[PDB]
Amino acid sequence: REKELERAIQVLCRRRKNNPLLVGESGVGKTAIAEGLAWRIVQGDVPEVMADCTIYSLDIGSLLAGTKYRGDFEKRFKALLKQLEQDTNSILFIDEIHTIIGAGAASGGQVDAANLIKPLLSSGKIRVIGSTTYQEFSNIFEKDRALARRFQKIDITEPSIEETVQIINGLKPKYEAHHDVRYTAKAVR
Amino acid sequence: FTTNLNQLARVGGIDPLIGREKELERAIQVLCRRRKNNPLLVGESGVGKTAIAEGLAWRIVQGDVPEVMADCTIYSLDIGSLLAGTKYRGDFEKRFKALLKQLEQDTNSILFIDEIHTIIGAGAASGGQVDAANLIKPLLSSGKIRVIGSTTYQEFSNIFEKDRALARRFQKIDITEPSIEETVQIINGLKPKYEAHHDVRYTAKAVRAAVELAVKYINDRHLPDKAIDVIDEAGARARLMPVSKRKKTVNVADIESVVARIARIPEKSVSQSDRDTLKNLGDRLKMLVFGQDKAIEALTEAIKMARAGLGHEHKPVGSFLFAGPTGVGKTEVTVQLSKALGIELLRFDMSEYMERHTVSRLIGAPPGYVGFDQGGLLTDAVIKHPHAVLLLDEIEKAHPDVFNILLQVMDNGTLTDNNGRKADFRNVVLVMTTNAGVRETERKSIGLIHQDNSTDAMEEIKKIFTPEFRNRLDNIIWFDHLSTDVIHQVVDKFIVELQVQLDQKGVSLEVSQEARNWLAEKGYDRAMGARPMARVIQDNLKKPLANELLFGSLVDGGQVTVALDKEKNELTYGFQS
Amino acid sequence: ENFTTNLNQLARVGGIDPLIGREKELERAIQVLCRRRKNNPLLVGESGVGKTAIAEGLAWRIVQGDVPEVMADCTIYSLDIGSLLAGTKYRGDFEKRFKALLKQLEQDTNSILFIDEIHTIIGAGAASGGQVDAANLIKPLLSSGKIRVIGSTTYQEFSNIFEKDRALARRFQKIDITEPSIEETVQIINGLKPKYEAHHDVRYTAKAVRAAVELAVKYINDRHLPDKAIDVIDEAGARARLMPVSKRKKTVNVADIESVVARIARIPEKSVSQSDRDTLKNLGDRLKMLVFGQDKAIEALTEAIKMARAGLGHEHKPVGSFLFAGPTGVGKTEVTVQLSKALGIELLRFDMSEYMERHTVSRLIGAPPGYVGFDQGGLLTDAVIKHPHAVLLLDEIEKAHPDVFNILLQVMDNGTLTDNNGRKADFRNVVLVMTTNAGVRETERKSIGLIHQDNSTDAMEEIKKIFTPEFRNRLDNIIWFDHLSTDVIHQVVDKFIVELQVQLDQKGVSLEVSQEARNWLAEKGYDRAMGARPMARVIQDNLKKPLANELLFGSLVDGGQVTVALDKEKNELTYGFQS
Amino acid sequence: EKVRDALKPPS
Ligand SMILES: Nc1ncnc2c1ncn2[C@@H]1O[C@H](COP(=O)(O)OP(=O)(O)OP(O)(O)=S)[C@@H](O)[C@H]1O
Ligand SMILES: Nc1ncnc2c1ncn2[C@@H]1O[C@H](COP(=O)(O)OP(=O)(O)OP(O)(O)=S)[C@@H](O)[C@H]1O
Ligand SMILES: Nc1ncnc2c1ncn2[C@@H]1O[C@H](COP(=O)(O)OP(=O)(O)O)[C@@H](O)[C@H]1O
Ligand SMILES: Nc1ncnc2c1ncn2[C@@H]1O[C@H](COP(=O)(O)OP(=O)(O)O)[C@@H](O)[C@H]1O
Ligand SMILES: Nc1ncnc2c1ncn2[C@@H]1O[C@H](COP(=O)(O)OP(=O)(O)O)[C@@H](O)[C@H]1O
Ligand SMILES: [Mg+2]
Ligand SMILES: [Mg+2]
Ligand SMILES: [Mg+2]
Incomplete structure (x- = not known):
C-alpha cells in the first residue's frame, strides 16, 4: 500500500x-x-x-x-x-x-x-x-x-493477487504465533 | 454577523x-x-x-x-x-x-x-x-x-x-466549464499564493501541460478544481523530499507522475507514447488472435485517423460494425484493443435489450422518470469514463428504436440523459457486431445438384437495417471465416487450458499433431465455428480422463498418451501410471 | 400568520x-x-x-x-x-x-x-x-x-x-x-406600460409591443403568450439602457426587440426578423450561392412559396406541400437543409421505412411505447408540437402503407391531427416536403428479354400510377431533376476540398491536387444510378488512408506542403510531403 | 413516520 x-x-x-x-x-x-x-x-x-x-x-x-x-x-x-x-x-x-x-x-x-x-x-x-x-x-x-x-x-x-501474497507473508508471523503453526509459502498462494 | x-x-x-x-x-x-x-x-x-x-x-x-x-x-x-x-x-x-x-x-x-x-x-x-x-x-x-x-x-x-x-x-x-485557455490564467493567478507555502516556483510549461493531462485522465471534477488540486499536490510532494527540499523547481516530470498516482494508472502513460504503441500493438493482435488479418489493418488505421485529426470534431472517433460468423475473433479483437491502449472496456449485451422497454432503460426515460432509480445505465458509464470502448454485440437483434438514438448521438457525438444535460461520446468508439451476415438455408434447394447460395455482399443487412444508419457509419468491416491452419493453431489454445488443470492433479498429457487435426476438422463448423470445439474437447479429452482420475490408472497421477488409428477412424487413449 | x-x-x-x-x-x-x-x-x-x-x-x-x-x-x-x-x-x-x-x-x-x-x-x-x-x-x-x-x-x-x-x-x-388572443395580449401590455416607462424613464412605441407578442409566439414555443411577452419587454428595457453606455436612447424600435428575443431564442438575428417582404425576395437568391446546381428548382420552389405566404391564401392548408420527384441522392435534400438553416427552423427527418408495418403507423398517431406514461405523445404529433413552424422531411415515402397516406390527407385539408393522446397541433405555419425514389429503382431494374431495352422514364410517369390522383389534386407543385452537370460534379470535388482544406488549416497543413486528377476522381465517385450518395465516401478515401500513417510523425506535423497528382499509367494519386 | 426521540433533562 x-x-x-x-x-x-x-x-x-x-x-x-x-x-x-x-x-x-x-x-x-x-x-x-x-x-x-x-x-x-x-x-x-x-x-x-x-x-x-x-x-x-x-x-x-x-x-x-x-x-x-x-x-x-x-x-x-x-x-x-x-x-x-x-x-x-x-x-x-x-x-x-x-x-x-x-x-x-x-x-x-x-x-x-x-x-x-x-x-x-x-x-x-x-x-x-x-x-x-x-x-x-x-x-x-x-x-x-x-x-x-x-x-x-x-x-x-482491492489489491492484486501478487500484492496479496506479500501481505499474507508479512502478516504470517502474527497468526503463526497465535495458532502455534507454520504456514507454507505454497499454501498461502 | x-x-x-x-x-x-x-x-x-x-x-x-x-x-x-x-x-x-x-x-x-x-x-x-x-x-x-x-x-x-x-x-x-x-x-x-x-x-x-x-x-x-x-x-x-x-x-x-x-x-x-x-x-x-x-x-x-x-x-x-x-x-x-x-x-x-x-x-x-x-x-x-x-x-x-x-x-x-x-x-x-x-x-x-x-x-x-x-x-x-x-x-x-x-x-x-x-x-x-x-x-x-x-x-x-x-x-x-x-x-x-x-x-x-x-x-x-x-x-x-x-x-x-x-x-x-x-x-x-x-x-x-471554462476553456483551457481561460484556466491557465486562473491557475497562474492563484500560483503565487501556493508557491510561498511550498517554497517552489512552477514553470510556465508545467502548469499548461497539467490541464491537458488532467482532463485526458481525471474526469471526476471540472477543470478549475481539478487544475488547482494537481498544483497543490505537486507542491506538497516537492517539500516532502528525503533530507531537505531536494527539488525546488516544479518541472513537467513532477506533474506527469502526480496525475499517475491520483489516476491509479501505470507510469509511462502520460509520456504521450501513442505513435509507437500503435505500430507494435498491431503485430500483437495477429499472434493473440489468429486470423482476420485484413480486418486488423482497418481497425488500426481507424484509430490513427481520429487521433491525427482526419475527422469532424463533433463526430466520434469511430462508428464501425463487425458482420461475420460465430467465434471468428470479433469479440477477441475488442478486448485486446482496450488492453493495448490502456482504456476502459464497457460492454453491453443487446440481447437483454431486445424488448422495447429495455431499450428505454438503456438511457432511462425519454419522456421522463422519477424516484431516484438511476435509470440509464449506459449514460452513467460514459460520465464515469469519457474515453472507453463501447461494444454492442448482436445489434441486429436489438429493436430498431435503439437505432434512432444512435442517429442523434452519431450526428453530434453526444447523448442526452433524463437528468444529465449531455454526455461526451466523442472519445468513445462505437463498435458493434452482427451474425445476420452468415445466413444459409438448412435445405439447399429442390434439386439433385445443390446450389451454392453465396452470401450477398451486405445486401441482406441493408433491408434489415435503416438506410441513414448505414451511411452515418464511418466504415463497415466484415469478418470472414478462418483458414484450416488457423484452426490447427486454435486447438493448441484449448489444449493449453487442459494442461494447467492437470497441474493441480499431477497428470502429464501429450497429444500428437495428427490427433489435433481430427479434433480440428470435427471441432470447427461453418454454422457454429468455435462453439462445438468445446463439446468435442470435453467428450474426447475430459470425459475419458474423468473415469480414470476418480477410479482407474490416474488416481494418484500419471502420464497420458493419445494416438489416432485409421483402421477405426477414432482416437485411441493410453494411460501410464 | 407570518407564513x-x-x-x-x-x-x-x-x-x-x-x-x-x-x-x-x-x-x-x-x-x-x-x-x-x-x-x-x-x-x-x-x-x-x-x-x-x-x-x-x-x-x-x-x-x-x-x-x-x-x-x-x-x-x-x-x-x-x-x-x-x-x-x-x-x-x-x-x-x-x-x-x-x-x-x-x-x-x-x-x-x-x-x-x-x-x-x-x-x-x-x-x-x-x-x-x-x-x-x-x-x-x-x-x-x-x-x-x-x-x-x-x-x-x-x-x-x-x-x-x-x-x-x-x-x-x-x-x-x-x-391563453388570451393576440389582440387581448397587446391591450394587457398597454395597461402595464406605465410601470416600466416610469421605472427607467423610457418610452415604448406601439410598433414594438405588437412586434413583441407576435415574435415570441412564432419563435418561443415552450412558454405561454402572456408571461413570456412581459420578459421580452422587460429584457428590452434593461438591455436598451445598459448596453449602449455611450448613447442613452429612450426610443425603442421593432429592430431593437429582435435582438432581445435572439438571446433566448439562440437563433440568428436576421432570421428572427419577421419581414415576409424582405425574406421572400432574398430567400431565392440566398439558396443560389449556398447551393450551386439545379438552380431551376430554386426558382420554381421560391415563387410557389410566395403564393402561399402572400397572406391572401387561407392558411388552413399547409404552407408548403411540394412533392419532389425524380432522382434521389441529389441537392434536393441539401436544399431543405440550407432552407431550414437560413430560416433557422429545426429540420425533422421522418423516414417511413421504420414505419412500413401497419402497426408501426400508430407510432406517428400514437404513443410509441403504448404505456401509461401519458406524456410520450405521438411521433408526428409531438414533433409538430415541439416545432410548429418546422418543415417535415418525408423520406422513403414509397414504402408507405395506404393508412399512412390517409393521415396526410387530413393535414393537407383539415390542417389538424387527432391521436390517442388527444393533443391538438397547429399546422397553419408548418411546411411539408417529400421525396420519390421509385424512379431510381426502375432505372437499374433488369429486363426479362434476350436484349435489354433502354427505359428513359420520366419522373411524372411514376406518380400517375403509384400514387392516386387524389393526392396530385391537392398537391401544389412537383419539381423534377435529371443531373446537375458534368462540370458541377468536378466542382463538387472542389467544394469538398474546400471543407477538407479547412480541416488542414486547423492542422496547419497545405495540400494541392492536380486539376486533371480532380476531374477523374469526380467521375469515378459520381454515378447516374447512385447520384452523389457515394461521392462523399470516395473523397476521404483518396487521401485519408495515406495521410493518416504519416501525420502522427512526419512533415505533415509542421506545414505539410503536400503535393498530389495522378499517374497516367497507374491512374493512382501520389503523395509527397515537403514540410 | 414513527420515530423515537431521546429527551435531555436540564442539569
Ligand atoms: N495493508 C494491510 N496490512 C495489514 N492488514 C491488512 C491490510 N489490508 C487489509 N488488511 C486486513 O484486512 C482487514 C480488513 O480491512 P479494514 O480496513 O480493517 O476494514 P474496514 O474498513 O474496517 O471494513 P468495513 O468495516 O467493512 S468498511 C484489516 O483489519 C486487516 O486485518
Ligand atoms: N473564473 C474564475 N475566476 C477566479 N477565480 C476562479 C475562477 N474559477 C476558479 N477560480 C478559483 O477556484 C475557485 C473555484 O471554486 P469557487 O468559485 O470558490 O466555488 P464554486 O466552484 O462556485 O462552488 P463550491 O465548489 O461549492 S466552493 C475560486 O474560489 C478561485 O479560487
Ligand atoms: N482467433 C481466435 N483466437 C482465440 N480464440 C478464438 C478465436 N476464434 C475463436 N476463439 C474461441 O471461440 C470461443 C468464443 O467464445 P464466446 O466469446 O463465448 O463466443 P460467442 O461470442 O459466440 O458467444 C472462445 O473459446 C475463443 O477463445
Ligand atoms: N389578465 C391579466 N391582467 C394583467 N396582467 C396579467 C394578466 N394575465 C397575465 N398577466 C401578467 O402576467 C405576469 C404573470 O402573472 P401571474 O398571474 O403571476 O402568472 P402565473 O399564474 O402563470 O404564475 C404578470 O406580469 C401579470 O401582470
Ligand atoms: N446541387 C448540389 N449542391 C450541393 N451539394 C449537392 C448538390 N447535389 C448533391 N449534393 C451533395 O451530394 C450528396 C447528395 O446525396 P446525399 O444527401 O448524401 O444522400 P442521402 O440523403 O441518401 O445520404 C450530398 O453530399 C449533397 O450535399
Ligand atoms: Mg473499520
Ligand atoms: Mg463555492
Ligand atoms: Mg466469438
Whole structure:
C-alpha cells in the first residue's frame, strides 16, 4: 500500500483540502491504512513533516455513553476539538464518518457533530481522516455538500493477487504465533 | 454577523477574473430587470460559480462594467456566523432585521449568497418562528432587493422546481466549464499564493501541460478544481523530499507522475507514447488472435485517423460494425484493443435489450422518470469514463428504436440523459457486431445438384437495417471465416487450458499433431465455428480422463498418451501410471 | 400568520398590477364565492397564463370597493407553501403549523386562502417522497365551509389527482383559463406600460409591443403568450439602457426587440426578423450561392412559396406541400437543409421505412411505447408540437402503407391531427416536403428479354400510377431533376476540398491536387444510378488512408506542403510531403 | 413516520 499512503500524506500536507477521505469497499484495508499510518510514523519510514504527527481515533459510542444532560455532547466534542487546534500537528482518524452526520442531536437542538466540526474545517487548522463506502458516501455523505467540499475523495481498490501474497507473508508471523503453526509459502498462494 | 465583498475586492485579495464576459453581461441583464431580477448561477460544483460573483465585484472597482451597476456595492452573507453563531433564539430575528434596514433604503445595494439552496430553511434549530428566505419574500416580490444565488444542476431540479413561486423570482443562468485557455490564467493567478507555502516556483510549461493531462485522465471534477488540486499536490510532494527540499523547481516530470498516482494508472502513460504503441500493438493482435488479418489493418488505421485529426470534431472517433460468423475473433479483437491502449472496456449485451422497454432503460426515460432509480445505465458509464470502448454485440437483434438514438448521438457525438444535460461520446468508439451476415438455408434447394447460395455482399443487412444508419457509419468491416491452419493453431489454445488443470492433479498429457487435426476438422463448423470445439474437447479429452482420475490408472497421477488409428477412424487413449 | 401574506393589505401600499381583461373569469369567481356550499373556486390553467394574477385582481377589486357588499369586507391571503415546508424537519411539523394558522383564520370570518399550486400539497408527490398528507388538512376546510380556499392547478394535474378524488373535486368548482388572443395580449401590455416607462424613464412605441407578442409566439414555443411577452419587454428595457453606455436612447424600435428575443431564442438575428417582404425576395437568391446546381428548382420552389405566404391564401392548408420527384441522392435534400438553416427552423427527418408495418403507423398517431406514461405523445404529433413552424422531411415515402397516406390527407385539408393522446397541433405555419425514389429503382431494374431495352422514364410517369390522383389534386407543385452537370460534379470535388482544406488549416497543413486528377476522381465517385450518395465516401478515401500513417510523425506535423497528382499509367494519386 | 426521540433533562 505504498502508493495509497503517498496520496494521504500529500493530501494532509497541502494547504486546502487537508482532510483526506479513504473511500473503498468493505475489507479492502482502508482502516488498516490509517491505523498503519501511525505504525509507519513510529517506525520512522515517513517524511520528517509527518514524523512529529500524532494520529488520534475517536470512538462515538463512548462519546454518547454519558450525554444525558443538555450540552453534554457539545461540551465534550468542543473540548476535544480545542486540543486538536492547539497542537496543530495531530490528526483525528474517524472511521465511518457518515455516522456523525445525524449523531449527537436527539431533537430540538439539532447540534450535530458534522455541523460543529464544519466551521473549523473551513479555516484548515484541524485535519482529519475519514473512511466510508461508495454506497454510504453517495447516499449520506454526498448529501452534506459542505463536508464533501472540505474532504478530498480517495478511490481504493482491492489489491492484486501478487500484492496479496506479500501481505499474507508479512502478516504470517502474527497468526503463526497465535495458532502455534507454520504456514507454507505454497499454501498461502 | 455580516461580510463585505466590495471592500475585499478593493483591497485586492481576490485575483482578477479571467473570461466569463458573456455570463457577466447576461447576469447583469436580469439584474436590471423590474421583475425576475434574481440571477441564479446554476452550474456544477467547482466551476467558479462563486468566483463569478467575486469577479463581478472586482470589475466594478476597476470600472469596466455598466455605469448603472458600478455605483452599486455588492455584499456577501455570513453563512458561518448565521448558521452557527446565533444558537439562541431571538437573536437571529433582531440581527437579521438589522440587515433588512441596511438592505433596504439603497436600491443599488446587492447581496450574493453562495449555496442558496441550503438556506431554503434556516434561522431556527427546531422552531417555525422565522425563515430567512421567507422573510425576504415580501421585499422580493416588489423587486426592490435583488440577489444572486448558487445551486448545483442536480439541486436546482430537486427543490427549486417544486416551488414555482420561488423559481419564478429567479432566472437560471447556465455556467459552462471554462476553456483551457481561460484556466491557465486562473491557475497562474492563484500560483503565487501556493508557491510561498511550498517554497517552489512552477514553470510556465508545467502548469499548461497539467490541464491537458488532467482532463485526458481525471474526469471526476471540472477543470478549475481539478487544475488547482494537481498544483497543490505537486507542491506538497516537492517539500516532502528525503533530507531537505531536494527539488525546488516544479518541472513537467513532477506533474506527469502526480496525475499517475491520483489516476491509479501505470507510469509511462502520460509520456504521450501513442505513435509507437500503435505500430507494435498491431503485430500483437495477429499472434493473440489468429486470423482476420485484413480486418486488423482497418481497425488500426481507424484509430490513427481520429487521433491525427482526419475527422469532424463533433463526430466520434469511430462508428464501425463487425458482420461475420460465430467465434471468428470479433469479440477477441475488442478486448485486446482496450488492453493495448490502456482504456476502459464497457460492454453491453443487446440481447437483454431486445424488448422495447429495455431499450428505454438503456438511457432511462425519454419522456421522463422519477424516484431516484438511476435509470440509464449506459449514460452513467460514459460520465464515469469519457474515453472507453463501447461494444454492442448482436445489434441486429436489438429493436430498431435503439437505432434512432444512435442517429442523434452519431450526428453530434453526444447523448442526452433524463437528468444529465449531455454526455461526451466523442472519445468513445462505437463498435458493434452482427451474425445476420452468415445466413444459409438448412435445405439447399429442390434439386439433385445443390446450389451454392453465396452470401450477398451486405445486401441482406441493408433491408434489415435503416438506410441513414448505414451511411452515418464511418466504415463497415466484415469478418470472414478462418483458414484450416488457423484452426490447427486454435486447438493448441484449448489444449493449453487442459494442461494447467492437470497441474493441480499431477497428470502429464501429450497429444500428437495428427490427433489435433481430427479434433480440428470435427471441432470447427461453418454454422457454429468455435462453439462445438468445446463439446468435442470435453467428450474426447475430459470425459475419458474423468473415469480414470476418480477410479482407474490416474488416481494418484500419471502420464497420458493419445494416438489416432485409421483402421477405426477414432482416437485411441493410453494411460501410464 | 407570518407564513401567509395578506394580499388585500398589499394593495393599499401598492405592488398590485392592474388586471386587463379576464372580467368573465373574475365574475365567475365572485359568483361562485357567494355560494353557500362548493363555493371554493379552482383555476385550471397552464403555467404563464396569469391564473395567479386574477387572484390578486380580486384583492384590488375588494379594496377599491367595486364588488358586492357581502364580499366588500372580505380578506384574501396567499399561503406560502415553501415557508412552512422548508422549516420542517420531518412530517407532522407542517401539519401542526398549518393547523394553527387555519384555526386563527377561522376565528375571523370572510377570510380567503389562495393556495397557489394546490396540486403540490394535495397529491401526486415525487418531490421529497411526497407531501400527499397535506390533503388531510384541506378536506375539512372544504366540508366545513367556514373559509373559502382559492386553488390554482393545471389541466394535467386536475385530472390526475383532483377529478379522481371526489372529496376535493366535489367541493371545488372549475374556471377554465385559456391563453388570451393576440389582440387581448397587446391591450394587457398597454395597461402595464406605465410601470416600466416610469421605472427607467423610457418610452415604448406601439410598433414594438405588437412586434413583441407576435415574435415570441412564432419563435418561443415552450412558454405561454402572456408571461413570456412581459420578459421580452422587460429584457428590452434593461438591455436598451445598459448596453449602449455611450448613447442613452429612450426610443425603442421593432429592430431593437429582435435582438432581445435572439438571446433566448439562440437563433440568428436576421432570421428572427419577421419581414415576409424582405425574406421572400432574398430567400431565392440566398439558396443560389449556398447551393450551386439545379438552380431551376430554386426558382420554381421560391415563387410557389410566395403564393402561399402572400397572406391572401387561407392558411388552413399547409404552407408548403411540394412533392419532389425524380432522382434521389441529389441537392434536393441539401436544399431543405440550407432552407431550414437560413430560416433557422429545426429540420425533422421522418423516414417511413421504420414505419412500413401497419402497426408501426400508430407510432406517428400514437404513443410509441403504448404505456401509461401519458406524456410520450405521438411521433408526428409531438414533433409538430415541439416545432410548429418546422418543415417535415418525408423520406422513403414509397414504402408507405395506404393508412399512412390517409393521415396526410387530413393535414393537407383539415390542417389538424387527432391521436390517442388527444393533443391538438397547429399546422397553419408548418411546411411539408417529400421525396420519390421509385424512379431510381426502375432505372437499374433488369429486363426479362434476350436484349435489354433502354427505359428513359420520366419522373411524372411514376406518380400517375403509384400514387392516386387524389393526392396530385391537392398537391401544389412537383419539381423534377435529371443531373446537375458534368462540370458541377468536378466542382463538387472542389467544394469538398474546400471543407477538407479547412480541416488542414486547423492542422496547419497545405495540400494541392492536380486539376486533371480532380476531374477523374469526380467521375469515378459520381454515378447516374447512385447520384452523389457515394461521392462523399470516395473523397476521404483518396487521401485519408495515406495521410493518416504519416501525420502522427512526419512533415505533415509542421506545414505539410503536400503535393498530389495522378499517374497516367497507374491512374493512382501520389503523395509527397515537403514540410 | 414513527420515530423515537431521546429527551435531555436540564442539569
Ligand atoms: N495493508 C494491510 N496490512 C495489514 N492488514 C491488512 C491490510 N489490508 C487489509 N488488511 C486486513 O484486512 C482487514 C480488513 O480491512 P479494514 O480496513 O480493517 O476494514 P474496514 O474498513 O474496517 O471494513 P468495513 O468495516 O467493512 S468498511 C484489516 O483489519 C486487516 O486485518
Ligand atoms: N473564473 C474564475 N475566476 C477566479 N477565480 C476562479 C475562477 N474559477 C476558479 N477560480 C478559483 O477556484 C475557485 C473555484 O471554486 P469557487 O468559485 O470558490 O466555488 P464554486 O466552484 O462556485 O462552488 P463550491 O465548489 O461549492 S466552493 C475560486 O474560489 C478561485 O479560487
Ligand atoms: N482467433 C481466435 N483466437 C482465440 N480464440 C478464438 C478465436 N476464434 C475463436 N476463439 C474461441 O471461440 C470461443 C468464443 O467464445 P464466446 O466469446 O463465448 O463466443 P460467442 O461470442 O459466440 O458467444 C472462445 O473459446 C475463443 O477463445
Ligand atoms: N389578465 C391579466 N391582467 C394583467 N396582467 C396579467 C394578466 N394575465 C397575465 N398577466 C401578467 O402576467 C405576469 C404573470 O402573472 P401571474 O398571474 O403571476 O402568472 P402565473 O399564474 O402563470 O404564475 C404578470 O406580469 C401579470 O401582470
Ligand atoms: N446541387 C448540389 N449542391 C450541393 N451539394 C449537392 C448538390 N447535389 C448533391 N449534393 C451533395 O451530394 C450528396 C447528395 O446525396 P446525399 O444527401 O448524401 O444522400 P442521402 O440523403 O441518401 O445520404 C450530398 O453530399 C449533397 O450535399
Ligand atoms: Mg473499520
Ligand atoms: Mg463555492
Ligand atoms: Mg466469438
